[PDB]
Amino acid sequence: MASFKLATDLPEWKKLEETYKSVGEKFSVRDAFAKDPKRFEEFSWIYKNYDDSKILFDFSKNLVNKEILDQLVTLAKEAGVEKLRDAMFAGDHINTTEDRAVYHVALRNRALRKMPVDGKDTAQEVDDVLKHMKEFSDSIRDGSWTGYTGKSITDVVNIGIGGSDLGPVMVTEALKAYSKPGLNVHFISNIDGTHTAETLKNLNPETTLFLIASKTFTTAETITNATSAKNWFLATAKDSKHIAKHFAALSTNEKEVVAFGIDAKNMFGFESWVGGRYSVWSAIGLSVAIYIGFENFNDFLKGAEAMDQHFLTTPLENNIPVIGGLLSVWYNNFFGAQTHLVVPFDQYLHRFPAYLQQLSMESNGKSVTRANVFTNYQTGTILFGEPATNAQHSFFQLVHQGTKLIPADFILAAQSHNPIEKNLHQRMLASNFFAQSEALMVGKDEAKVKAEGATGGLVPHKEFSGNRPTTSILAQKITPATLGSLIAYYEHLTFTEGAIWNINSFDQWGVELGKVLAKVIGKELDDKKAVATHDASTNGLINQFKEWEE
Amino acid sequence: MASFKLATDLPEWKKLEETYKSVGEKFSVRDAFAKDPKRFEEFSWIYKNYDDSKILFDFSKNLVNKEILDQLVTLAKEAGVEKLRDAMFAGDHINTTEDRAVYHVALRNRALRKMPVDGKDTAQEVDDVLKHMKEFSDSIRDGSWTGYTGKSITDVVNIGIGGSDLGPVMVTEALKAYSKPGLNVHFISNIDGTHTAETLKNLNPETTLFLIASKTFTTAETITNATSAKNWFLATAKDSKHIAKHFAALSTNEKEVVAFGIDAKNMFGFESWVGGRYSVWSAIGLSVAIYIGFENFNDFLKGAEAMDQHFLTTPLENNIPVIGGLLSVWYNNFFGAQTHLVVPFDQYLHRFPAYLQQLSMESNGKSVTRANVFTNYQTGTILFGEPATNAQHSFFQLVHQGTKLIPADFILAAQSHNPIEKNLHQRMLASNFFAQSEALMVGKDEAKVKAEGATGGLVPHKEFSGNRPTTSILAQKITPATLGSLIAYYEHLTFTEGAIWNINSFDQWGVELGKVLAKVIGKELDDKKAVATHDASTNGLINQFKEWEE
Ligand SMILES: O=P(O)(O)OC[C@H]1O[C@](O)(CO)[C@@H](O)[C@@H]1O
Ligand SMILES: O=P(O)(O)OC[C@H]1O[C@](O)(CO)[C@@H](O)[C@@H]1O
Ligand SMILES: [Cl-]
Numbered sequence A, B: 001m002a003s004f005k006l007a008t009d010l011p012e013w014k015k016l017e018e019t020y021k022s023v024g025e026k027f028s029v030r031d032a033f034a035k036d037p038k039r040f041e042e043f044s045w046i047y048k049n050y051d052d053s054k055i056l057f058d059f060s061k062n063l064v065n066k067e068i069l070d071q072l073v074t075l076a077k078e079a080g081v082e083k084l085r086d087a088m089f090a091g092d093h094i095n096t097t098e099d100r101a102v103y104h105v106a107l108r109n110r111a112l113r114k115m116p117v118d119g120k121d122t123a124q125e126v127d128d129v130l131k132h133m134k135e136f137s138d139s140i141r142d143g144s145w146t147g148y149t150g151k152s153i154t155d156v157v158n159i160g161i162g163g164s165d166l167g168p169v170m171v172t173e174a175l176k177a178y179s180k181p182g183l184n185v186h187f188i189s190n191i192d193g194t195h196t197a198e199t200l201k202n203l204n205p206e207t208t209l210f211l212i213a214s215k216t217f218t219t220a221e222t223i224t225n226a227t228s229a230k231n232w233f234l235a236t237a238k239d240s241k242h243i244a245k246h247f248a249a250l251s252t253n254e255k256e257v258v259a260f261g262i263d264a265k266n267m268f269g270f271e272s273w274v275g276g277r278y279s280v281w282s283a284i285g286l287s288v289a290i291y292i293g294f295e296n297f298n299d300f301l302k303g304a305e306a307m308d309q310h311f312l313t314t315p316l317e318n319n320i321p322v323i324g325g326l327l328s329v330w331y332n333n334f335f336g337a338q339t340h341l342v343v344p345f346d347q348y349l350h351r352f353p354a355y356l357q358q359l360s361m362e363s364n365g366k367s368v369t370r371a372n373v374f375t376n377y378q379t380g381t382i383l384f385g386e387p388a389t390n391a392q393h394s395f396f397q398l399v400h401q402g403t404k405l406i407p408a409d410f411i412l413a414a415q416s417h418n419p420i421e422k423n424l425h426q427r428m429l430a431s432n433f434f435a436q437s438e439a440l441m442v443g444k445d446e447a448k449v450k451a452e453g454a455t456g457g458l459v460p461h462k463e464f465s466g467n468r469p470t471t472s473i474l475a476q477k478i479t480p481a482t483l484g485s486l487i488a489y490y491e492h493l494t495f496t497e498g499a500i501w502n503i504n505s506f507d508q509w510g511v512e513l514g515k516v517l518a519k520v521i522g523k524e525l526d527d528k529k530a531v532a533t534h535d536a537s538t539n540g541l542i543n544q545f546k547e548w549e550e
């Protein structure tokens, strides 16, 4: 049980409402730098990773000062962020609505600390599956695991959706510099048949390995897609006994895996207490281990592990994911900003925002607290983004000159995996990273617009308000370890947010209605008889489809 | 000059504020269907394309009725949406801040109507460039245009960013079913050197064609990327005279094209009155013409042309892009929703939301009206999305159970280009399209949660508010013509929004400050001396980078 019902009940929440009116709403970042010559030092933190690599988190261009952050910290203490965190790490069933542990932290327990669920250490069982993942990925990569005609595997297709897809996609894209030429990964996720047809078009069944990734192993799209891949494989291979060399499963559900015709020796298991949107660390990351090798995958886990130890052991006021979460609440609940922009100045990280969208929004898009009452305040933010410099030429116009507050996180690596032309492109990329946050803060007033040459009614069109907040995250390099630490940062930021809002960040009851309603309609699409069983819009859309379908 | 200063000054705006309080804020869609047995018929419209194909636009699950829509129409009339539209089509300089025509409509004038800028018909000059595009793309595709060693082209790389990139990417992805095996398109856009290195990795200079796409032909990232591709080509080809077989330009700026070492015969020109985010219809779409053939590209243009004729000639109250724009304003300015979700139930359309993000947000992210005063009300929405069914497993949890209003557009084709398994996947995909909008509208109350088996404090966690609005857009098939009509729909929706807000949807002054600030910093990154020329955050970030860079 929670210690409180609603976040709005916490005494510091009421205090922050007043602080918002007196100091927050008209906060001047320019004035803050001028008041405090140590602002950068006070509002930036160096994270040191397990391998002594570093990441600078600079919050100093945010609409925050010591007064405000101290209050947000007091709010975090009243909301029991620490008690909930420690319960999570203790293996307690803090996913209250499903009565489950929340133990993604245990997936990357490479130190083999004691980490019990139901009073039973999980360290060894997690480790065993990783050992299996190492053996199998090494086999694929060295060419000793051969297909049904005795050939080495050249292509691996992950089939899965949401938590079983976005992670493998994002991380294989992000760490693509660590891949081996000739060993390619592919993804089928959408039920849209285009996805199957386009992905299998040029693949050879003799040298293609499928990974069927589903926590439940009952997701409608995934089982259907896996059946279609099995059909495609057998159209060439003919005999079902060959499936054992070409189909593995990443799942919690051994029963359904085996019922599907996948051998238990080819299952890479995980438990219920791994949420899908926190599963890349598990068996789900097998595609990653194959693409870039197990040791790199282990390094990614150990980056998460080090950020977990940071989150667990650091006082709130210096606790980097906590500070990120506190600013989010500040913007979401006091300013009323609805969005949170995440912009990697990194092409490899192009699918990093899409990944964070699930982690953040599926966790925190809730309307009911742990005391089982409805919120009377905003919960999860809408998270979006694209890589820079692309994003500068898409929607940054609105970020600079629009009417909406859009808290933004910019991410850059100091070193590129691709330092072509003796780093000409890298320095240009970096210059944009620095200048965009600079621009958003400093703006450009009327006087400067006039000095730069505009007259009359053109003048206001060229003004920049400035005072637009950013968080800058500078890594040395986007290694596996760095990426693991960065994801864990957003995981614990997400944690802090949900803890303050007193929501359950770890369930997803909101997907069930669409699932049940789609099955009903799917049966109705088995003929071309007009339907009148729904609302008139749903009926009209279905009936128009029936007239227009093949 | 504008007829009014601020949208908030229009008498109907003030009326709508009252209508919002009395009827809008607590609007019940369920009650609306029960009051009006003809609601679906009254709030849905069939668009008929030039080829007699059709698209159903169903607005009936929105928070609107006849009273509200009539008021929004009166607002559109007070704001002079029609006068501004007709000025645009007349070739008038409605891009007031740059004193330019806004004439993307003239790019797809395949009927060769008289469409003058500065009193001079553009029909023939636009047509001439399309004839050049047809000849050249036919040459590439039939193999008669050979590289410097006499081989046919196998790969085409578009180099360009923002308006010069997102369109080519989105449309080649969307219409990929119409492509030819062995003739591939690639994109370099980011200045991040990863983008160049990864794209050119496996290409052969002897059979690779570059399209340097830049309206200005001065964009820093694009010229740098084009120089790098020219370096890569010449590392193999050795002699600069071979460039003429491997480099074309899509630009307004012949001077800079020629200074770059591209031959004028290999330039595909367009004019200043084509905004980048409305340029795919121009020479910029050359990659599309090569990928799927000129005739398919012409069909795409003629789809835009037909939607333009719809927009131009239809009374507001039946004018489909107008209705979409009016609902946007309703949600943005009366409910205070900050976002607009666009979800294609279509894998090919995976980059359709990212494209719309520029069109919408770069157009409408403005704070200054055509009367040259600052707005005191919300302008552009934050547009985001991913394809379904993927999006259902990412952030739809928040769309169903979060605390934010998120107006959503769902798009489905009744027929797939990939109807595998006698349409098993297609019917499943469609069932999700229908069920998601159904679910968002109908919700699930306390009583039903109890009937379905929940007790005690679990009950509220499983409730769905419902009354969550969607627009459903059902096409027969995503042909070129359909896609052209769909983009033009968002273009004219964007138009309507900007017209009501009295902003200039056609400039982008907001990108200049970041550009100027990045050049300053770029010069500072040419050494490793600490810098103190900026704010302390910008200085600290730069200095940390200098310590950590290669
Ligand atoms: O891994 P599974 O069980 O196929 O589920 C896929 C996804 O669908 C959800 O259950 C519902 O969105 C996600 O949380 C999950 O990641
Ligand atoms: O086509 P160009 O001139 O290289 O410009 C690229 C993009 O950058 C902008 O000028 C600024 O974002 C866009 O409007 C444009 O599409
Ligand atoms: Cl603002």
Ligand SMILES: [Cl-]
Binding pocket: B402, B403, B404, B405, B465
């Ligand atoms: Cl709501």
